[PDB]
């Protein structure tokens, strides 16, 4: 039937558990390395590790050791890109080291680290240059494989550091960094490896960022500037000057993310409305500035704190094929596109299986749907062209219950069902053999494999003892590796499976049949290019070889309506109801308007509403090219005219050096008339004020309110600016008028007396007591009560102009008391100022006389003569019943016995009860 | 009958008019000078002058001239005090000069002036030292009779410059000046001849430096709420003057600091009418009440006057006018202000029926210093150069009036009053009150002359001249010990002056002997001889004796002391008399008690408290016993903390985080050495200090988190306990604001203005709203306001916001229409799903709607305005302007809305519709 070999190997170290990282190194070397690492729970995440090395297809592993003292290698060991050099890092309790090897891990030389470690990053082409992120947010660099080190930046952000492009930027030693400047600022720096001392420079002028520097592998550079009202986003093509990215003007953005800047254009996702659910997919032009709509809604989750994810996948086998998941209402649908985002379509159902009754769904009512990147407790692989295998549902939407493994071998044109429940999938020999293992918690020893692209499957016992399946790997050939811990023991075991005994013959050039790449409409001209791949013949058993030849038949097509899409500000009308696709101009934008900050001398390029698909290679010249070659920019009218006083302004005292400053925005080319009126008769006309750079002096004589009016007049437009100023300076003193003592739940009339009588514009801050934030009042008087007893501080603050006066006063709040009203004589009013000291002394003398006439305690009588113009008094009698005797005694000592007052020479005042 | 000589002289220069100044010079010289000056009307006041000199009792005047070019000497020529030196000043059009003479005006030497002139001032004793006030407010000085000059100060105040005392201050070259410092400050300088400056304490002043001839010095410090006044005795440290604590003062004025005490007048309540007369102690600090109400007017702009007069004949006799309700009464005192009494009526005259007033119902009243003259003349001044002679005009009844002016006199210092003249008369004393001359003050010409030799009991008339003369002025020989009178005036408007020198010496050839005088004991209205604890007796010339009182007059020879009695003591600071006067004792008033310590009593010093009684200052009664009440109280306790104040440097309104905040603390009433200063800045920073107010250095702090904080300070002593609080706010960031307003709306339509700020709900914000033509804005605490527009056209609406100490401001232009028609508009429900409140979205939607309406009706586009409102349900208003045929347009628009659907392509495959709205 079949023919294969299985070789098992157990890691002899029984002290093995948790995780492991297995990696090959180089081609035509046959050397494999394994790192067995032990994680820790309860937020510990501390590690213990062991190293294994093989040099014979992974059949004999030796456990490597380093010195009598065993160094604990951390999880991350870094290989050199493109060049076989290995670096291992170690971490303990605040003590670290490194190990270097240039002999495929044969001789590890130890070196120390004079700093912490978090991650590393090599150079794309230079094998010996590498930089390091120090855990306390530092950036070091080394050009000698990390033997010696030097310092660069000290406040770098997490994982926003990138090397220069190999092909672009002309400089291989550039380092783009994002770092914290000032207190609460972030800026984008650019240094060199050897000289970062004073050589860096700043490409963006302003340089504020909320941690969002991003430069993808290709030629584009991005920047995210946070602002006051609405944030902005800038872009740089070929490291040129930055330009503000053009999004839909009124589709306001919240967050955005760069999905893929592949080939010559950019794909971005922008969440418009804060649904925390749906994103919109937009596509740019060559420079990455003019963005247009592509897809409406896509799923979005926040798995990690800083990392968000968007349900979209590029098929790496065929360039220009994308899959996505939309969410409308509460329904999750799946769509796929071959036109690189122009037109999306649903998935074609298979309607067949090994146990598939054909009563299942038809096109019109329910389709196929797939789980892309989200696994509600999934892998979709694509290493070979046209082979797309994944788990999904089949119906009107996706659900969490059903997980069925479907596959397609012709890039989505023909779908077929294979497995029930999820299965780990592995391709071998450029999609020559497809292996699958059931993902489950129970142990097993089975193995599914297919040779005819998923049409006929075969089972085989690859081992004897059942093993828990942990992972599958393949050679950078037909060597498969299955690693996992067995049922009985808890130690690791690897099984190397060799399919090379079967079909030993090498494929010739005539052993493949041609398969033309089509779409769901049967059209061959995809992206203006007819493509055809090679598929192994069913009646042929051979190995596809060291290098696979495919996509040999590639022809060009003539340009058609399907090869053009809408530009910035244009959308498809009626969903192409009339005939075919038509890009009509939406309401918000018209092609007449100039772009933001068009400066004279430069030339912006407007569009007619149609643009060729980027990287489409159809026969150009004719066929609705619509290349405008529009170079123009018009003269600007005076806009954003601003007038102010030097500093924070809006406060003046008479006879003071007031300095007025004026500023403009759009342009200084035209001669401008500046008419100026300062509201006090001073009329004056000036010219070239914004270009002169000199302020205007003025001194106001009379206190009052004034209005400054300025008019800027040109041949293009006409603008006006106004500024109201107040000159109200003198504030001498204030006073808080308040009763010195009052009972609980009694209405208190607080008053704020100022030096000028009823000032026109005053604000009052009132501080009651324990409550911190004060009350705002426009009137002099307020009314308040006291629920608590004891002593309370009442504070008042006033500020007419830019000067503040403030006064506090302590008041007593009683509880056990009796109230007695008191009339005074009429003559006293002729010698009664509102001075509180006079009132206090009058109350003291009245209390003294009452104590002399009743022989009762003096501290138990409180006299308050009030602030009213008619002299009215209140007598509070405390208890701490016998209180009736004291009350009667006081009433008799008031009525029957006159309480006399010697005010001035020959003037007597009397006090009695008050109705 | 009588015997006298009259010698007339006419200034031969017929070109003479306007004014003249006549002055003598020296004794035993017989030299007189006259300066005839000609003023000019119509705000000109430019002068032309001539000089006359005589050397024989004014019988032969020579018109002096100086050089071929006649220099016009201005009004002021200055003589040397005490020393015969004369200085003349000249003025032209910005060119001046001076003339000096040391030979009684025999040889005038000319010198120039390198500056302007306004007034001069000599030294009390140094004849060659003199200072000058330059018109543009400068002060120059010269020690060589004004030949050479040097500069002192450049911003001096008008007539507040004084020389040092001759007896006091130990320094003769001191100059006390008041000058303007900084911008809007005034200070008191003390300068010397060689260079100018301050040794004594000083501050801000509102032009009120005053140093009377005697040993006292005063100062008036203006403050914020209530001003203060300081005093300095014998040029010592200044002390705050003690007035009644609750009798609040408005203005005060120093009347007389004569002998050993001070008299001040203080207006308590702003009646612009009555002042209160107060008396001080030796140092001039503890003031007590003396008199209640006195008249007060503002005749000149800077000069005020108070109706009170000191009798220069007898020290300690004062006259005053009180005003109660609307009645003006007159009072006099002999006790130097202790007890006042009304005037005794005469009840007799040459034509005096005795039915006139009696004591109980109506008295005598006199016009002291006030001349209410609706008609011609009527000006009254009461003079007293001789002891006991007081002559003046007044009324007789219950009060003073403007009508009646009758000249009364008293020769025994107010004990016996007598009526003399009807209507006013100029009066002149000769030979220490030996001959009394009088001339009727009137507009008509006259040639009569009244004179009396028996102290105003028998009067005689005499034709002193032949032709009737207009009476201009009267003068006498220096010393007032001769009998030469001089009457000057122009005769019958003959355009020239005439002087008449009258000599009474023929009738009085004898020199008085020591036995030609009779004794007159000085008494009061009660007949008591012990006045001021001193029996006094003066000399009066006998009626049967014709002699000249002589070069020097001997009087008050009998002066004996009396034993101290109740009448020789008065109340001290804070004590008043019980019941009323002339009835029933210095009792302590309510506001002050003798327990309290004085202001700023420092440990180690000893203040002297009082019992409520003090001896009349300068009373020389037999002391030792008789209620002396000399306490000899030397003690001082520690003072409690009073007037604790805490603030930020300057007028800090608001603060931003991470800023240099400087806190300052100060005390006022009293100072204490050991002091606890507890301090809490409301952000966890607790700290205790000592000697904060004495160090004088602020405290630095930087707030980190924005918010509101409270600074609390506590001063703790063994005497008391004080606390000071200061609330501060740190609310700095204001990024941007926006005025949300409909771009256009009709007349009398309710407009909802809104002010959007960067924070959605800022806690404490004030909003200033500027509607349009009205200047003063409206104040608001809420974001939104509602207003209308009565006028049409274009209107600017402005809004201003200020949370902390930062201001944001935004304006917007709105259109107000008149000829319009309103159409409501429903939008589709789907549109609400893509409708943000961004105004640009709304404006573009309105623009597209207007475009489609213009395409569907072919009517003008500018006459259709679409406003889609800010409401969450999308509602639109369409305004159709006229500048009838408007019905056709309205019907066309309604049909183009209903019958023809107005489509809107929002997004790919989404159509919106608009129609009419119920
Ligand atoms: C690598 O190995 C393959 C097959 O083993 C061989 O064809 C190839 O030539 C080798 N590479 C080189 C550079 O020789
Ligand atoms: C960089 O610095 C080194 C010294 O550290 C110096 O020799 C070299 O010339 C510098 N290179 C540049 C480009 O500044
Ligand atoms: C400045 O003023 C000159 C003449 O007043 C005018 O020609 C010019 O256009 C103005 N603006 C400039 C130089 O930018
Ligand atoms: C003052 O208190 C009285 C009595 O409680 C109250 O009627 C009045 O409204 C208060 N406020 C005033 C008078 O402004
Ligand atoms: C002035 O002269 C007279 C007459 O000789 C003489 O009595 C008198 O004493 C002189 N004056 C003085 C101040 O001596
Ligand atoms: C005048 O001189 C004194 C001491 O000679 C000096 O203190 C003072 O400052 C001088 N005046 C001025 C204005 O400098
Ligand atoms: C002046 O004298 C004449 C007689 O010589 C006399 O009739 C007259 O009354 C006197 N008085 C006046 C004012 O004429
Ligand atoms: C505190 O202030 C007093 C002044 O009352 C001073 O005498 C003393 O030396 C000061 N102590 C200090 C500064 O330590
Ligand atoms: C008010 O001020 C406090 C500062 O303590 C701040 O935390 C709060 O956000 C502000 N606004 C409201 C509505 O409390
Ligand atoms: C103004 O605002 C109020 C709510 O504060 C609303 O009820 C009213 O309809 C608004 N009126 C206009 C004319 O906008
Ligand atoms: C931001 O700008 C919009 C205009 O698009 C304005 O309506 C709004 O008031 C501004 N401020 C805030 C806080 O949104």
Author numbering:
A (entry chain A): 131 to 212, 216 to 510, 517 to 615, 619 to 1022, 1032 to 1066
B (entry chain B): 131 to 212, 216 to 330, 335 to 721, 724 to 1022, 1032 to 1066
What does the paper say about this structure?
The type I transmembrane receptor Sortilin-related CNS-expressed receptor 2 (SorCS2), together with SorCS1 and 3, Sortilin and SorLA constitute the Vacuolar Protein Sorting 10 protein (VPS10p) family that is central to many pathways in control of neuronal viability and function, and has been associated with cancer and neurodegenerative diseases such as Alzheimer’s1 and Huntington’s2. The cross-braced homodimer architecture and the domain composition of the VPS10p subunit followed by two PKD domains and a SoMP domain is predicted to be conserved among the three SorCS members.
Sequence analysis indicates that SorCS1 and 3 share this domain composition including the SoMP domain. The two 10CC domains wrap around and interact with the bottom face of the β-propeller, leaving the β-propeller top face exposed (by convention the top face is defined as the β-propeller surface that contains the DA and BC loops). Except for 10CC-a all domains participate in the large dimerization interface that has a buried surface area of 5790 Å2.
